[PDB]
Each structure stands twice: as C-alpha cells, then as structure tokens.
Design an enzyme around this catalytic site. Structure first.
Site, short mmCIF file in Angstrom:
data_model
loop_
_atom_site.label_atom_id
_atom_site.label_comp_id
_atom_site.label_asym_id
_atom_site.label_seq_id
_atom_site.Cartn_x
_atom_site.Cartn_y
_atom_site.Cartn_z
N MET B 261 0.85 -1.20 0.00
CA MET B 261 0.00 0.00 0.00
C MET B 261 0.88 1.25 0.00
SD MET B 261 -3.11 -1.44 0.16
CE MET B 261 -4.48 -0.52 0.87
N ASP B 308 -7.97 -2.17 16.91
CA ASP B 308 -6.93 -1.20 16.61
C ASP B 308 -7.21 -0.38 15.35
OD1 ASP B 308 -4.58 0.05 17.53
OD2 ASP B 308 -3.25 -1.37 16.48
N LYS B 310 -7.70 2.95 13.68
CA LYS B 310 -7.31 4.34 13.88
C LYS B 310 -6.71 4.80 12.57
CE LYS B 310 -2.93 2.78 16.08
NZ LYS B 310 -2.05 2.98 17.28
N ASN B 313 -3.60 3.34 10.83
CA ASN B 313 -3.68 1.93 10.42
C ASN B 313 -4.54 1.70 9.21
OD1 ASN B 313 -1.97 1.14 12.40
ND2 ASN B 313 -3.53 0.08 13.64
#
Ligand SMILES: Nc1ncnc2c1ncn2[C@@H]1O[C@H](COP(=O)(O)OP(=O)(O)OP(=O)(O)O)[C@@H](O)[C@H]1O
Ligand SMILES: Nc1ncnc2c1ncn2[C@@H]1O[C@H](COP(=O)(O)OP(=O)(O)OP(=O)(O)O)[C@@H](O)[C@H]1O
Ligand SMILES: [Cl-]
Ligand SMILES: [Cl-]
Ligand SMILES: [Cl-]
Ligand SMILES: [Mg+2]
Ligand SMILES: [Mg+2]
Ligand SMILES: [Mg+2]
Lengths: 494, 519
Positions: B261, B308, B310, B313
């Site tokens: 990515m 997790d 956020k 991420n």
C-alpha cells in the site's frame, strides 16, 4: 456433413481411456513418428517446452530441406548449420555428438542431413519422449486413440455416385458423413463372393491395403460389412485409369509422349518398390489398374491376385495374372519372385508409348494359348516412336529370363532408378509428391442378379467378421487433421 | 459474484524491457525457471490430500475457477451455463445506467425456450422467479452454480483440466521462501522491524514485506500478537483488508509478505492535505468510512474483533482505495463465544466497555470508527484538541465522562453518524447487527454511495495518490532461544497462501505462459 455424426466425434473423459494405456504400443517410433496425431501432439509438447525448442526446429528444418526445390537447397543447408550446429547460435543443439556436428557441416548431397536426422530422433526418443509420457499431451493422444477405436461402420458413409464396376460389385464415391472427406467404397457382394470362391482374393487385397502406406498405392481407411456386402473404403481416384488415357488422349494418334510415360513409370516403380520391400508380389500390374487422382498423380490398385511371402520365403509358385502381362517364369510353372512385376512394368510402359501390346497389334484377336506362345517365344520389336532410352529400358524389363531382368536388387530399385530413361526425373521430389504431373484431368447399369442357392454357415459369417476389421489408424488420423476435426476438437482455449 | 482474475495488461507490457536490462528491474531468470509445471507422477500424493469440494476448488481458487471455466467453454453442452454465469457477474458489477438493458439481454439470451443459449436445467419456478424481481439474479446464480456442482463438475474431475489444476497446486506447494524476494526500499517502520517494498523475483509482482526481529520479539514477548496478525491476514480475503501472500523466516526475522500500500495512511493525509486547513471534505471522509466499514464487516462476520482501528492503520494503495492493517491486537472469538475481556488498543480509540473492564464484542470497533471519522472531518480527536498534551489517565476520564462537541465543519448527517458511533453505552451504539452492517449502511451519510460498486472495487476514489510522491515523513541485548521459540518460528513460517499466490500467477502473466497448450 451430417450433424448427427459430427456430434459423435467428441473426446472422451479420461476414465474411459484407462484400458487403452495397457493395450497400446507405446513405442517411440510407432507413436510419435508414424502416427500423424501422435507426431502432432509430440511436436506440440516440444513447442511448449523451451529446452526442446532447438531439437524440434532442427527436426522441422531437416524435413523442410529434404522436400525443398533444388534451387533453394544450398541456402537452406547454410541456414541450418548456422542455426543449429554452432556453439554461439541461439538454437544450438548441445545434445549432438562432436562427430555428428562435423559430418553435417561437411559436403552437399541428396541425403545431406539424414545422418543428422537419425541423431535428432534418437535423442528425441530418450528424455523428451519420457517427459511427453508424463504430460497431458500423451493423455490427449490416448483420448484420440479411444475415438479412433469407436464403431465407424456402414452408417457413417454416404454413397452418392458410381465411380466404377468390378467383378463382385460397384465402386462408389462416398462421403464420410462426420468429416465430409471423399473416398472410394469398393463393395463386394457376399453371396457372389462365396459362390465364385473369391474370399482369399478379397482378404489378401484388404490385408495388403491396410498394412501398406505409400503415396503410390491406394490406401485403405476403413473395412466394414453390411447385410449384403463387404466394403473397403479407400483413397478416391477420380482421374480414370492409364489404359483409358492411352487411347482417349487422341483417338487418331494414341499413346503418351515420352516424358509423360516416364513420369508414370517412375511412380509405378516406386509403388512396386514399396510392395517388394514388404515381401509382396503384386502380380496384376497393367494400365487399367493404374489410377489417376485429381492432381494427375497415379497409384497402383487391384491387389486381389497379390501374394505376401512368409518370413524367410524368397520365391513362390502360382499361375495368376492377366494373359499378356504374365512373365515366362510364371507361365512355365517355375518359382518366381518380384521379377514378374518388373516384366509387367515393361509391357505396361510399352503400351503407354506404342498404344499396343508388345505381343499383339492394336485391337487384335488373340486367344490365350497363342498369347502364351508369343510371350515365351516372340522377340519384341520397337517402332520409331521409342527413344533409345525407352527402347533399352523396355528391353531390360522384357528380358524373358528373370535372372537377366532389371528389377528389385539388394532391398531397393535404386539400381533401376539409375537408368538414363529417368535422367530428367528428380527422385527425391517424386517420392515426396512435389513434382508437377504432366497432365491434369477435369452409367446406370443397375444391380447384379441376386445369386441363387447361397446360404451362409458360421465359417462364412466368421470370415466376414474377420474381413470387417474396422478403421485403419493412420488414414483415420490423416482424415481428422486434413478435414479440420483435429483442429476443432484439440483446442485448449478458443 | 466473485471476480475472474485476469492478466494485468499494463504490468506485463512493462515487463519485457525490464527483462532486457541486467539491473534489479529484471525478474531473475533463475527463479522464473523454477516456475515450471511438473510431470503428472509428482501430483499423485496431491489427489488424496486435497479438498476437492466444488465451492473450494472451482469458485474460490482463481486458478481452479479459471480452469473449470475453460473446461466449460470447450464443452458445447455447458456453454449456456457458463455464459449465464459470466453474464450474472457482469450484471452484478455493471454501471447503474447499463443495468436495465443487461437484465433484458440476459433474460432473452438464457431464459427463453427459443433462445440458442437457453438453460434447460433450470426450474420452471427459478425461470419464472428470475423473470421478476439488487439481488435480482442471486436465486438464479445459486441455481446455476448448484447445477454446475453436479454433472459438469464430475466431468471436469475426469478431464485434463483437473489434472492441470493438480499441476498448479504442486507448484503452489514448492518452497518459496526468503531467497525469492528482493527488498529494495523501506516503506515504513514498526515496533519490531521495518516494512520493505519487495519484488517477488520470479514474477516481478511488488509487495510489502513486514519484518519482525526474532530476538526483539522474544524479549518483548510479542509472539502472540505476531501470530494473531499472521493467522488472520492468512484466512481472510477482503479487498478492504491487506492480504497475506507468504509467511517465511530468515535467520534473524519473521516475515509477512502482503499487499503493498504505497498511498500512505489516512493520518498523514488528514494533516498534509493542506497544513493550514486540515481534514477531509465530507464526500472523501464518507468514502473511506464506507470502505473501512466493509472491512470491519468482513472481520466481524468471521468473529474477529480488530481492536486497533485508527487513521494511522488505514492505508491507501496506488488507486486511492484503503484497507485496514495492523492486526496484532485483534482477537478471534472461539466457536460459540459471543464476547471477550481484555485491555488492549490505543488510548483515545478504546471504547468505555473496554476501559471499564467489562465484556465486549464488535461494538468497540464501531466506537473506534467514530473516533476515526471525527478526526477525518475535524482534524482533531473528539476528546482532545489538536496537538494537545494529554496523559492516558485523563484521556480515559474524558472518554468515559466527556460529551463530544461538534464544530460547524460537520453536516447534520456526519454529526448524527458520529454520535451514533460514539454512544458511550454499547447497547445504544450503532454497529454490527444480525450478521451484517446492512442496518448501518442505511444511514443517510451514505446516501450518495453505491454499495454494490464500492464492495466490488468499481467506484472511483475521491483522491488519487501521485506515483511520484511518497506519503510518509522522511541489537537487543542477552536473548537466547530454547525450542519453544524454534518451533513457534517454524509454525509462524507456514509458507504460501494459495489464493493470493494464484492471483499473482494470473495477474503477472505466468499462468498464461505456462498454461498454453499449443502456441
Ligand atoms: N480408388 C478408386 N477410385 C476410383 N475408382 C476405383 C478405385 N479402385 C477401383 N476403381 C474402379 O472401380 C472398378 C473396380 O476396380 P477393381 O480393380 O477394384 O475391380 P476388381 O473387381 O478387383 O477387378 P478384377 O476382376 O480385375 O480384379 C473399376 O472401374 C476401377 O477403375
Ligand atoms: N502493506 C503495507 N504497505 C505499505 N506500508 C506498510 C504496510 N504495512 C505496514 N506498513 C508501514 O509500516 C509501518 C509499520 O507497520 P505496522 O504498524 O503494521 O507494524 P507494527 O510493528 O505492527 O506497528 P505497531 O506495533 O505500532 O502496531 C506502518 O505505519 C506503515 O507505514
Ligand atoms: Cl503437461
Ligand atoms: Cl501425352
Ligand atoms: Cl480433456
Ligand atoms: Mg481384383
Ligand atoms: Mg500501525
Ligand atoms: Mg501491531
């Protein structure tokens, strides 16, 4: 094409090919060189495996050289050696001997790369062939063999026109319904066969046309039976027979020009050679039995009087053949070999050129006993129409003593091929079907009287069953490829 | 509805003149030469050991699907079934403008006794039902696939195409470890080692390789998190979650090879989009929200809590589509487990249930989503002002006690949605219900979003990252390994993931090259 029958040419699931794995001859030369579909699949296997590329392309290039024009050969030889025989080259063939590479670079000749071809094919028969056996391509071959063994009898063939008439029935032009390929179908009436004791002749013709594969002999594709007939489906020859063309070419001035006679003589000899190399004596060579196809190439036919010599048999006895064509040895009751066919060749060539037999004048009334005396005693005279070469060749063939007669020696006709009569003929191109033939071509008698007093015993039925042995592998494969069916059914992703 | 994986046109044409060079660009001929189909003898043990279920083999595995469809294509009698299957997929992913006519074409092609591609095998009722009616042809697809799973599948098992599948599976199982991958630049940095951009040397396909230092893992007792991330990335296949292609070990590191990515992460883009006026426009925020939700939904449908979510991420790819990442804090609920305990997550993103020591489910992820959407719009946390110094204890108090305020930058739709997600009581909070997020997708915040096209990756992202740009700012003492470590490392390093591997072979050209019958 009948859709019904084309719809039955479908490859089968792999499970139905199991029994075939065990029963088949999986020898290299039988599968990958001699069977057209086996060759095509093996070559495909090679083409998709980069490491075998050089081998494949040399193989194809040697074949391309072998069948090329005289003019183009010097260059193709040079391109071959630059492509495959040099360490530096992209398609260099590592697997070859130091000794083989040397020879292939040396010289220039008719069989310049045959030693090379032998080496290539020996190599191909080892590792590559084993990898092939462990590939999908071999499984696909098995699928094709399965299809090949499926029933393809009477119902698969559409008779649509009468090509000729024989002693036991008509010969028809017919279409194989599934592929559309045209064939001759010789029908032999079962009752007439029995009544006239023709079983042996019928069977010998069928066995011979089935096992022999020559562009100079008509090929048997299928043998089947119907309620009333035995049938041989074979190479269609629409051109008519040499005898017709001897007298039709020009009613007033009959006979062929020398080059045209030589050409057919060359093709007939090659046909004779193929029989003799297989220990077969033809015993019925004559102009009416040599047929022309659509291109003007000829083939011998009518093999009902032939004989196959047994393993380690060199000669035979037997009074058979056509009066006027039978050689002295034969007429005299002696043992004879291939010699008799070369005598017949002489009579045949003689008529091709002179428009009459060597032993009787054109359209003369001669009963058999006197014809037998002429053949045994009369010296053949030659009109001005013969050249020195044509005269000499006929003399060489019409020698009354077989021991002095030109013919099949030491496993070939290569000696005969040396006669100056053939000075202008290219034998390698003749044998490959590459030459231009000298001439290109462009009745409702009814049905035979259903013979009386003929009932069948089990023995007759068993002979018919044995005769009707079905499909011949090689011609069947040739048909599948020619006709487009192999292409269509072999596609992996269209 | 699944997609048919096809060769990447652009990638393969860029490949020929990367190979003409003797530089790193070139795929290594040594490794490409190991991608060769084996003889059939070597595939025997595979026949017995493999799951030869229809749905597993012919629907879910890209090479299996691809070979099954070829079998169907070369067998005239299965032509209608195949094309109807392809046309239902085409319909499902088509533009809204083109659908009416594709629906009519389909029914004229396949559902009429007269038509040349008529589908005899169908029910009178499915035919009838399919002539009326989203979901227009799901019943029909289910019937087509049900039919395909019977006779035609059994014919496929008895064909060369199945044997060819076995061949590909053999090659799929061969060792493809450390030496197959070229790390060429550093994408980012984590807690246990760097994440590298790397090239799979045989195919040229680019990936992210996350390295976890073994000693640092042990010393910091990070095994559980390492393994949980790897097992989850391995078993889930979503366009909204980074995919694991390979897991291997080196002398010093544990390695996860996964979707690259290169777009940077949402946090970076919140603040670097315009340093003077940060935050996203509403449409852009909604778009990412919809993609995040879809990723959450896939996890929750497999009984996984992320824990997790956020901005830092959520990663962007080269097209501007996002995926969730960093699964080391996730938890997989056991068969028939409905909730869990456990204090984990990032301060300011953890929901009150979690902070109060209570049992919780997927609900915490939705709280995290709300915090994340708020930040996307407002350029600051709901609980702290932009760049404010707040220790954890007070942050915990704010999250438990403080009512969130919303500046003018929010629309009524954005405000309501965040309020729905930031409900302090999980029982009152919007989220996963009845096995889906369908209820959540109903909120008018998503009025403009087309869900079926989002889910299929067809929509045009609102921001396309520039391929020039990089969107990210410019030994361990006395540790030894007993055996609990060696064996853990061996188990972690479970090798190749079938589906991504098959996707790679097709996208990259290798399937096409090695699958030719007669070139
Ligand atoms: N392949 C063929 N294509 C076309 N016509 C053929 C073919 N084979 C034979 N003929 C023709 O069919 C008829 C039968 O020829 P064939 O020599 O087979 O008959 P036969 O009954 O064996 O004759 P014989 O009594 O001389 O042995 C003739 O008209 C012949 O010219
Ligand atoms: N698939 C990927 N493609 C590109 N970059 C990535 C990818 N995965 C991770 N990164 C980069 O590496 C950084 C560290 O990755 P990640 O956060 O997963 O490691 P981590 O050690 O689990 O971090 P933490 O312990 O903080 O959760 C990320 O912030 C991101 O920039
Ligand atoms: Cl193969
Ligand atoms: Cl003439
Ligand atoms: Cl098949
Ligand atoms: Mg005869
Ligand atoms: Mg992270
Ligand atoms: Mg982590």
């Amino acid at each position: 094409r009948d859709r019904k029958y084309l719809a039955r040419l479908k490859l089968p699931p792999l499970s139905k090919c199991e029994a075939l794995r065990e029963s088949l001859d999986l020898g290299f030369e039988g599968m990958c060189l001699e069977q057209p579909i086996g060759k095509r699949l093996f070559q495909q296997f090679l083409r998709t495996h980069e490491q075998h590329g050089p081998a494949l392309q040399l193989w194809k290039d040697i074949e391309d050289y072998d069948t090329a024009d005289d003019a183009l050969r010097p260059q193709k030889a040079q391109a071959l050696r630059a492509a495959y025989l040099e360490p530096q080259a992209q398609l260099f063939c590592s697997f070859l001997d130091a000794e083989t590479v040397a020879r292939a670079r040396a010289g220039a000749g008719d069989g310049l790369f045959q030693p090379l071809l032998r080496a290539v094919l020996a190599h191909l028969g080892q590792a590559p062939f084993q990898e092939f056996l462990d590939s999908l391509y071999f499984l696909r071959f098995l699928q094709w063999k399965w299809l090949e063994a499926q029933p393809m009898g009477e119902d698969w063939f559409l008779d649509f026109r009468v090509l000729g008439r024989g002693g036991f029935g008509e010969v028809f032009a017919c279409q194989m319904k599934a592929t559309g390929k045209l064939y001759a179908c010789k029908k032999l009436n079962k009752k007439r066969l029995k009544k006239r004791k023709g079983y042996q002749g019928a069977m010998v013709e069928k066995k011979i046309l089935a096992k022999v594969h020559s562009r100079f002999i008509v090929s048997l594709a299928y043998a089947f039976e119907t309620k009333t007939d035995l049938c041989l489906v074979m190479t269609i020859m629409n051109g008519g027979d040499i005898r017709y063309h001897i007298y039709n070419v020009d009613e007033d001035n009959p006979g062929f020009q020398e080059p045209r006679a030589i050409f057919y003589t060359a093709q007939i000899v090659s046909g004779l050679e193929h029989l003799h190399q297989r220990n077969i004596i033809y015993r019925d060579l004559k102009p009416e039995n040599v047929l022309l196809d659509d291109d003007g190439n000829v083939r011998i036919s009518d093999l009902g009087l032939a004989v196959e010599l047994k393993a380690g048999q060199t000669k035979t006895k037997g009074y058979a053949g056509t009066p006027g064509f039978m050689a002295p040895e034969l007429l005299l009751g002696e043992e004879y070999d291939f010699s008799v066919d070369y005598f017949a060749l002489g009579v045949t060539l003689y008529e091709m050129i002179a428009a009459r037999g060597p032993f009787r004048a054109r359209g003369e009334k001669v009963e058999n006993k006197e014809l037998k005396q002429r053949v045994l005693e009369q010296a053949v005279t030659y009109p001005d129409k013969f050249s020195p070469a044509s005269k000499d060749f006929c003399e060489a063939l019409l020698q009354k003593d077989p021991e002095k007669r030109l013919g099949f020696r030491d496993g070939s006709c290569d000696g005969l091929r040396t006669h100056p009569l053939f000075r202008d003929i290219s034998w390698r191109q003749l044998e490959a079907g590459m030459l231009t033939p000298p001439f290109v071509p462009d009745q409702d008698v009814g049905a035979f009287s259903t013979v009386k007093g003929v009932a069948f015993e089990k023995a007759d039925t068993e002979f018919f069953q044995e005769f009707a042995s079905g499909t011949c592998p090689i011609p069947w494969q040739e048909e599948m490829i020619e006709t487009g069916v192999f292409g269509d059914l072999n596609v992996w992703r269209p």
